[PDB]
Amino acid sequence: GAMGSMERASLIQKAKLAEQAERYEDMAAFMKGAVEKGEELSCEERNLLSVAYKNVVGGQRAAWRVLSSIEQKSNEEGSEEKGPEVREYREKVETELQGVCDTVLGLLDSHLIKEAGDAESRVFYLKMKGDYYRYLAEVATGDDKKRIIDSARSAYQEAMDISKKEMPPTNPIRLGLALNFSVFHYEIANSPEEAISLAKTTFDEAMADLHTLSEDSYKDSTLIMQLLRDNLTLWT
């Protein structure tokens, strides 16, 4: 790999520089190189990995949705035929997005998840696995769509089981996992009631644990609680 000759610490340093410069493709490539050094990642390093790929795939998802909307309109009644170009270019972006998801899932499988023993790392990586299978599910249309959906569900469920056993209800990783699994239920699994129930129960349990927290921890937890509330307001 092109990062094989660079020191692990230099890759991390450059990932932080790329973030400051909003160069997220570079940031992702640097953190991929750091993961491939084979050492476990610290808390800060895990969040650099997540930030980088979340931004890259976020831009690809936004573009895919623009192009998919155009393609769907072109297939309505009374829409003039414009040839294969819209489909081709949507497919190009889709393939690039799938490739990024496959890359992340490959890093998790070789070998981040199997070496992750602490709840904070294991839940973080399993949430990531659920997230990137969810992104694959958003564009899936063929024979393997059900298996992609179930792979997302399975990863989220394992993360949830650990998080409920090992973390307090206000833990930001636990909260963000529940937020995203709730979105999975609503957007992917056609289960809006499950989505709503999960978001409400997560919010209420966290509310009841806020009294245990410092001011700084209270700020971190309430930030994600507000995202659960935003979704509940959208959905009810």
Binding site: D131, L179, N180, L227, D230, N231
Partner: peptide
């Protein structure tokens, strides 16, 4: 309109 994830 936007569904929130993190």
């Amino acid at each position: 309109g936007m569904t929130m994830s993190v």
